Amino acid sequence: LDFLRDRHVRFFQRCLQVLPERYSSLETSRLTIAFFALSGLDMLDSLDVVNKDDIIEWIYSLQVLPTEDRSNLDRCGFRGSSYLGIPFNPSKNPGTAHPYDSGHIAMTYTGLSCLIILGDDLSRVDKEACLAGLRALQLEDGSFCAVPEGSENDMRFVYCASCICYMLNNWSGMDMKKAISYIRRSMSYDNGLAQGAGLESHGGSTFCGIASLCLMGKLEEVFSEKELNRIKRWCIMRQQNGYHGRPNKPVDTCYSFWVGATLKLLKIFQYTNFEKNRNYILSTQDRLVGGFAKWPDSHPDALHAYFGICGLSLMEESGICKVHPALNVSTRTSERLRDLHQSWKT
Amino acid sequence: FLSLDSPTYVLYRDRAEWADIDPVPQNDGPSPVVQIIYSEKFRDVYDYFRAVLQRDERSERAFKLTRDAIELNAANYTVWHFRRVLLRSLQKDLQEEMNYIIAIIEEQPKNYQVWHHRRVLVEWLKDPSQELEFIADILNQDAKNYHAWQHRQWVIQEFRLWDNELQYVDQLLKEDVRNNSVWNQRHFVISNTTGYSDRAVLEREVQYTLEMIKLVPHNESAWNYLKGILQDRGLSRYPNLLNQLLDLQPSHSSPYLIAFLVDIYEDMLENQCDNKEDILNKALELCEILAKEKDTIRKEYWRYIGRSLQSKHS
């Protein structure tokens, strides 16, 4: 049908306000929910409907700053929320030592990303601390963990690391050569990229891999033309109407971005079928509450609302800003980020 | 011990054993963002979890508290980490924890934290004896669960349990020849055992795949496997493959087959073959067949491939 723009604006506004007891499982990643909402409003050019200053303070209260004795550097970055009970402190005083308080790579990523979207200049971000924290998360094989205490490691976090380094315009946060090696090793026999070596290639990991390389500005250098052609073939084969994440799996709205954005970075999204993709995405639109779902006649959520919108953006939907396919922010925001980086170099 | 939905459940704020602890509340400051509303019971468990966490109390009561915190939110990675700290400090029976996590995962098979927890346990115990069967059960409710397959590959590689996997793969492919995860497992097993350099193995595999393709010709997974194990050897180096596929075209045609042929023809052009301009024309003919009638949704893609072939071989 048609794109219910205002309905989605309200949907995102609601997400920023209060969530029902049944979303408790997102408690530790509330910052990524905020990102979906803010970046989503940004994409719809409606950031005006929120108080950028309040949200900026909230985000800064999530930053894990180094302590007086700088003994917790390997644990700096951003928290997903205040679930640990640390007193509200919008990156003012130093860090109040806590046995289990550390950052989470996906939160440091969405956190910085949110700050940039809200117009903040990142002056209150302890860049060196975050980078030190990032470095500590990388494993021998080049991939990353999410927290210093330990977690699973895969392509998802390689992408987070890349985004962080890119936004802080400093790649000392990772051993790029090893990360690139991990990305190459994840390529499957079917030519898509998997979460790790030997695993089933997947639209999500293929996006994370390709986008990371583009952020590093090494796509061409890492993959040969023949290789890129094979990857392109795998990616464009994901379109059924909407896109699925793996061969023989049902389509899901969010892949219109994961795969679509990858195709965009590979310069062949232009050859996909726009109409069927757009029609599928809209068929998952919740005309009553707003937002999008993974499947039609299914309940909407912040993740699919945001990616469905970004998916539409890839085809320049009337009313939606163009999304930067590798950074996962509006081109406008990526532009402001360029000015920011430039401004720093003085 | 005391279940969260038991008639006699008592808030921690009313338990004598917890009187000495001061609960620590969560505070999102003056203007909270994406704030989740919590029931009295929920907030009560976590207000005490924060207290115990903040003091790094390695107690038996804290251990029991994590069980509740986990029931309320199994996705809280910090809770799982602390529980692991406690498992060590209190030297708890890890075989018992295995039963616990086994039940937790069955109820939440798509949670990252629970699979990570089980992996740490198996590493601690250096015992993979229950793994393959447990995973097979999970794969029974969802044969494509990415977490399950990832865990299965880790177990097999870490403890070298390759002996029966190829047979397991054969069984699952019979249940659903379209399961892309199983085809990936097959390649995982083979390339990590015999490898594909043994012409006898390659032949067995190519023949096996063609048999599967004949059963269900429209299966991207089967075709991707076939092309995957041959693309690096050089598709044009197998003259009988080209004609066997051309023979299938009559009845068993599908966009995957046409695409394969196009790829064969391209390899030939890439290797200065004989009748170059003739081969190129055979390819272009197929590219258009795909665009115009066999894989129309990718119409612009196939034509883009065609233009690429012409400007590269003329």
Binding site: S29, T32, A106, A146, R156, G204, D252, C254, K294, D301, L303, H304 | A75, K110, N111, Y112
Partner: peptide
Amino acid sequence: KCVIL
């Protein structure tokens, strides 16, 4: 739902 974390 799609749990990515």
